Design a binder for this molecule. Structure first.
Ligand SMILES: [Mg+2]
Ligand SMILES: [Mg+2]
Ligand SMILES: [Mg+2]
Ligand SMILES: [Zn+2]
Lengths: 300, 108, 166, 57, 152, 39, 148, 266
């Protein structure tokens, strides 16, 4: 990019500019905190064939969670930060919607991105994942999406990068058994033996060979949700999640055949704090989850 | 393992002329306000650094001349002076180490 | 042996007339016998071609290469000779026009392998030529836009005649 | 007319003189085609076309 | 793999690198200025941070005394350390060491830097002086701040 | 700008994206700048 | 070896075939040697053939250097400016005469690929062919798939 | 007939230049001194009727030519493309200095002149009001409704003028020729009369930008390429115009640019 901003600023304008940026961002967020008050477009009811908008949370860490049956179940952490809609585009094969996530400084960005994010409220985000939504649910840009969008007892898919191990060898990249230590190896312990046949003077495309492991987007299907938080906007999903800690992850509804027609009890468009909606408790629990503070279990 | 066919001059030229191997031009050369010896960003000057090094070497030589033999390291601070200049009333116990030199236009 | 770059500095042109251009003054200078390779010298020359003398010296003063100091000294000597001998007032109004680097007279030594053999170890020597032309540097040839490509295509399609007939 | 808005057209502009064409000529654009048609008409009027007489030696 | 790995390998092992860092720290405590590679420079700076912390913890403390006796091979810099670099910075907390950069070495061309304790009697270094406040952008920002203040 | 411009030129002239790129100095010098004037 | 040899389209120097016919041969300079066995043919020619050749076409002037030369040459200039400096080292009188006649008959045009032995200035008489030939015209010139 | 008026003004400017240059005494040389902060005590032996501090900068290095904006001779400001007289000290000014006030004032005056030129080329002027730099917006009243399209057109014209890259020719001329050049607009006549009455003599500084000429007081920017950014905030009330512009080597940012534009919009 061009010349970084912190170059022609004295020792007195840096903190002033920082405070001004923070105040402007906070004011924009507070102004956009009211979606229903502004034109929210007509809201449609639930239909058999129709999807909803997802979220983009941050993978904090992991912690265990015991169920009522007395069994250990690993659970992940997903912090829904801001998560606002950028724009909307109709017919490609189906409608699309852009969603952001974390709040990245608006100094190390392209002029086009800065102009696009200035046309709308809020500051520029980090990533922009496009979701393939139907024509039914259509939320206006600039609206927030907290963790209340999802509810317990639901399978939600997650996709994100992975802890890239760089250009790895062969065993760690594909799980090859390599060669023995003795009888009678001298320089062969992790190398790949034969390629493929002999007469074939070529190499079958896609053959397992040393390459850059990880550092790619991989989706996981079949992940149940146990508990959700409203204050901190945290989502606790079962099983691990691709990507390192403090890494943005794309989350949306599942796609399996056994979990497709069950969004009747879920909010078809998105959760709206302003209501005319009856606020939810501090955190919704599940039917098969040991609540924090409840008496000890007893299989009698 | 051995070359089966010598690389042609065209192939050699194409290999030793791509932008990936050519020296990448840099644009991080500014003008130093002191002595204008075109310094680099995030890096100190050249003539000023040499002057500071010479001054530090002279100060160390003077300290050694005053300290004497090795294995000393007194438990008192230091104060550098120049021609004239009465010692500061605040630093009276600190050992003064100097000889003969004029205060330059960049030392406090 | 063949010294010519040093003799080119003695070329004399007839006296110009009032109704004629200024004719930018050309400079020639080179150092013989340089304990250095030739590929790196050619790399440095290619790096310093379209740039001016000031930018060239600025890039050389921060180029981690043995030949950088040699090229800087050569450019300084050429600038001094141009300001003194060739008669030039402006010191920064000079730009590089030609820059090459050929091999020199190499010797031979022995390396001694790990057996009853060996190999010739030539002492690679090189040179360095530079041509500084008076006046500011010319602008770089910009990339032909789509309009130029369309015009060339139209010209090629219009400049076609029937083949194999009258 | 050949093509249209393809950057490589070829219009055959004519010149009707009281429902009686006197000449014609093609051209890249419409104005250039009309100019070429007028030039060919002037040629035909002056008898300078390629179908004239060679000479008498 | 080196995901979240600290301590850059330098010498032929942990003992060699820690001995080199100790020698560099001793040389700095003796002269208050050393020209070393950037890696070793930052490593010795991080080590001297904790060294000054221990020296500030107290002199009668057996732990600090043992640490000073170990990290200092000359054995003559312990009193100077404890009685100069601990009371002088009795007000600061973590503002020690001022790291910069050297152009390069005239031999093998290596990235070198300089580090020294603040308040030293040696001459000052050419620190990167920011642009003055009387410039165009600075004046515009000052006017904007004044207008924002007067808005209230 | 190279890729998009070449694609636009190809779509406009309905030609391939191979002849749009330039050629080395060999073919440039091999070209005859003084062709034989015919007719 | 045409790709590695220049070519030229067939054409005349001034269209002499239309009006008057002009001799393309300009001058001829013979470098005969008095004392030397390497110019007996040229000597016999200059003796008993050059006069007849010059009188057969008064539109050409010939010179006779007659200088101490080791190899006799002939400079055949032309109107356009071409020069054909050939050698006649050891050649019979008949051969030299035939060579001189050929030089006088030919023009100054280069001796390279003629390519297309024909220069038709106006090859089209009934109208040059174009893609819009031998085709009809519908009513009002309505292109296909056109209502109004 | 504005074209004829501009042509006559350019002809008068050329005639004044010829008159000022005819008095050259066969190129008289002088020995001017330079007292700067770097590389002392270098000197120069330039001319006294054609040479300019730009020649000294070129003799020194291209860095000064690209960074120098004003030359301080005897403590007074001077232009980069202006003939010098009386051998005295020479200095250089840039944007990153201890007291770059003269450079800021020159940049403000140059921006005002460029805004006036763009307004004149758009489709009667009055003068060039000297507004402080802290105001955050250069003003240029004009006697005669603007919209977003008009502001965009003015910005495009200013960008084109900057891309053209033309020098600022200055001349110290009396008030007679100044009035002869501006023998139509009464406001400019009164301004020139006041400027002449202020100075001890009738001498008045002038400026020329291709086909645009205007009167001012302090020096200006030599080349228009030094002005990187340039915009037009809005218009206020005979009609007072506004605008903001940043020079090269001080590229702020899109956010800072928008903030400065909003602050100037007043
Ligand atoms: Mg194994
Ligand atoms: Mg082994
Ligand atoms: Mg090692
Ligand atoms: Zn300096």
């Amino acid at each position: 990019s061009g010349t970084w901003w912190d170059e022609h600023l004295s020792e007195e304008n840096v903190p002033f500019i920082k405070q001004l940026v923070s105040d402007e961002d906070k004011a924009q967020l507070a102004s956009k905190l009211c979606p229903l008050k502004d034109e929210p477009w007509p809201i449609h009811p639930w239909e058999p064939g129709s999807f909803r908008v997802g979220l983009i949370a941050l993978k904090l860490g992991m912690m265990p969670l015991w169920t009522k049956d007395g069994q250990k179940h690993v659970v992940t952490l997903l912090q829904v930060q801001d998560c606002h809609v950028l724009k909307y585009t109709s017919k490609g094969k189906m409608a699309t919607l852009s969603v952001g996530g974390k709040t990245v400084s608006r100094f190390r960005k392209a002029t086009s991105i800065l102009e696009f994010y200035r046309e709308l409220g809020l500051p520029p985000k980090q990533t922009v994942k496009i979701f393939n939504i139907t024509d039914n649910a259509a939320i206006k840009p600039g609206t927030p999406l907290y963790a209340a969008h999802f509810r317990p007892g639901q399978y939600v898919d997650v996709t994100a990068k992975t802890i890239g191990k760089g250009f790895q060898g062969v065993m760690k990249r594909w799980g090859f058994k390599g060669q023995p230590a003795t009888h009678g190896q001298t320089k062969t312990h992790r190398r790949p033996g034969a390629v493929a046949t002999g007469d074939i003077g070529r190499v079958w495309p896609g053959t397992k060979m040393p390459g850059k492991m990880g550092n790619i987007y991989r989706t996981e299907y079949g992940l149940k949700v146990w508990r959700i938080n409203t204050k901190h906007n945290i989502i606790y999903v079962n099983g691990s999640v691709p990507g390192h800690k403090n890494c943005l992850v794309k989350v949306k509804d599942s796609k399996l055949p056994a979990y497709k027609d069950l969004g009747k009890n879920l909010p078809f468009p998105t959760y709206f704090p302003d209501g005319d909606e009856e606020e939810l408790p501090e955190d919704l629990y599940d039917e098969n989850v040991c609540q924090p503070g409840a008496p000890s279990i007893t299989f009698a | 393992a051995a070359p089966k066919n010598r690389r042609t001059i065209e192939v050699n030229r194409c290999r030793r002329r791509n932008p990936q191997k050519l020296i990448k031009v840099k644009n991080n050369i500014d003008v130093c306000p002191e002595c204008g010896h075109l310094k680099q960003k995030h890096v100190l000057c050249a003539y000023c650094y040499e002057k500071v090094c010479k001054e530090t070497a002279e100060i160390r030589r003077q300290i050694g001349k005053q300290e004497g033999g090795p294995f000393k390291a007194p438990t008192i601070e230091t104060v550098v002076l120049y021609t004239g200049e009465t010692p500061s009333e605040q630093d009276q116990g600190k050992r003064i180490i100097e000889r003969d030199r004029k205060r330059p236009s960049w030392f406090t | 042996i063949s010294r010519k770059w040093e003799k080119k500095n003695k070329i004399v042109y007839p006296p110009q007339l009032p109704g004629e251009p200024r004719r930018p003054a050309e400079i020639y200078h080179c150092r013989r016998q340089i304990k250095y390779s030739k590929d790196k010298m050619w790399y440095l020359a290619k790096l310093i071609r379209g740039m001016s003398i000031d930018q060239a010296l600025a890039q050389l003063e921060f180029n981690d290469k043995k030949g950088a100091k040699i090229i800087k000294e050569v450019l300084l000597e050429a600038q001094d000779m141009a300001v003194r001998d060739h008669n030039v007032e402006f010191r920064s109004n000079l730009y590089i026009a030609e820059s090459t680097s050929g091999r020199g007279q190499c010797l031979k030594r022995i390396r001694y392998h790990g057996r009853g053999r060996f190999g010739i170890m030539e002492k690679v020597y090189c040179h360095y030529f530079v041509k500084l032309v008076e006046g500011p540097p010319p602008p770089p040839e910009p990339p032909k836009t789509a309009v130029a490509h369309a015009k060339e295509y139209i010209q090629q399609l219009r400049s076609r005649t029937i083949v194999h007939t009258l | 007319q050949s093509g249209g808005t393809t950057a490589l057209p070829l219009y055959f502009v004519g010149l009707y003189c009281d429902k009686k064409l006197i000449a014609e000529g093609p051209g890249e654009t419409v104005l250039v085609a009309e100019e070429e048609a007028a030039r060919v008409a002037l040629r035909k009027l002056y008898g300078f076309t390629e179908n004239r007489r060679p000479w008498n030696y | 793999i080196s995901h979240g790995r600290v301590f850059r390998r330098m010498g032929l092992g942990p003992e060699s690198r820690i001995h080199l860092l100790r020698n560099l720290l001793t040389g700095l405590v003796r002269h208050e200025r050393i020209e070393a590679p950037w890696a070793r420079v930052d490593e010795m700076r991080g080590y001297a941070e904790k060294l000054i912390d221990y020296g500030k913890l107290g002199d009668t403390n057996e732990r600090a005394m043992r640490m000073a006796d170990f990290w200092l091979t000359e054995k003559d810099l312990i009193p100077k350390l404890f009685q100069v670099l601990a009371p002088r910075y009795k007000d600061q907390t973590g503002g020690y060491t001022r790291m910069l950069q050297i152009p390069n070495r005239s031999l093998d061309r290596a990235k070198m830097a300089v580090i020294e304790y603040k308040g030293n009697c040696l001459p000052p270094l050419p620190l990167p002086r920011r642009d003055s406040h009387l410039t165009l952008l600075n004046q515009l920002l000052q006017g904007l701040r004044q207008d924002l203040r007067q808005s209230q | 700008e190279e890729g998009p411009m070449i694609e636009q030129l190809s779509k406009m002239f309905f030609t391939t994206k191979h002849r749009w790129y330039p050629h080395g100095r060999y073919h440039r010098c091999r070209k005859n700048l003084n062709p034989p004037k015919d007719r | 070896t045409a790709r590695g040899t220049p070519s030229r389209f067939l054409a005349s120097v001034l269209h002499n075939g239309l009006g008057r016919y002009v001799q393309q041969l300009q001058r001829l300079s013979f470098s005969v040697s008095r004392d030397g066995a390497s110019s007996r043919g040229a000597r016999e020619f200059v003796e008993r053939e050059v006069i007849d050749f010059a009188r057969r076409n008064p539109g050409v002037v010939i010179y006779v250097n007659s200088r101490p030369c080791c190899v006799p040459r002939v400079v055949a200039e032309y109107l356009n400016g071409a020069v054909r400096e050939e050698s006649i080292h050891c050649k019979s009188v008949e051969e030299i005469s035939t060579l001189v006649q050929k030089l006088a008959d030919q023009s100054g045009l280069d001796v390279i690929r003629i390519r297309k032995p024909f220069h038709t200035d106006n090859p089209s008489i009934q109208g040059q062919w174009h893609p819009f030939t031998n085709k009809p015209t519908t009513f009002r010139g309505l292109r296909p798939r056109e209502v109004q | 007939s504005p074209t004829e008026l501009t042509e006559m003004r350019n002809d008068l400017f050329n005639k004044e230049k010829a008159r000022q240059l005819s008095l050259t005494p066969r190129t008289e040389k002088i020995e001017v001194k330079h007292v700067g902060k770097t590389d002392p005590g270098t000197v120069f032996v330039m001319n006294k009727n054609i040479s300019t501090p730009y020649s000294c900068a070129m003799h020194l290095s291209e860095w000064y030519c690209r960074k120098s904006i004003l030359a301080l001779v005897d403590g007074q400001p001077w232009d980069m493309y202006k003939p010098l007289t009386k051998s005295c000290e020479i200095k250089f000014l840039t944007f990153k200095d201890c007291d770059p006030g003269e450079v800021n004032k020159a940049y403000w005056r140059s921006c005002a002149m460029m805004m006036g030129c763009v307004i004149e080329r758009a489709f009667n002027l009055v003068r060039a009001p000297e507004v402080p730099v802290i105001s955050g917006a250069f003003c240029y009243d004009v006697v005669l409704m603007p919209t977003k399209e008009n502001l965009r057109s003015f910005t495009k014209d200013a960008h084109a003028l900057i891309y053209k890259d033309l020098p600022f020719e200055t001349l110290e001329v009396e008030a007679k020729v100044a009035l002869e050049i501006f023998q139509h607009s009464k406001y400019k006549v009164d301004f020139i009369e006041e400027k002449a009455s202020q100075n001890p003599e009738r001498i008045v500084k002038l400026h020329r930008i291709g086909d645009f000429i205007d009167v001012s007081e302090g020096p200006l920017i030599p080349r228009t390429s030094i002005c990187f950014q340039y915009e037009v905030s809005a218009v206020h009330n005979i009609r007072r115009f506004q605008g903001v512009s940043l020079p090269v080597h001080l590229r702020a940012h899109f956010t800072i640019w928008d903030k400065l534009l909003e602050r100037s919009r007043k």
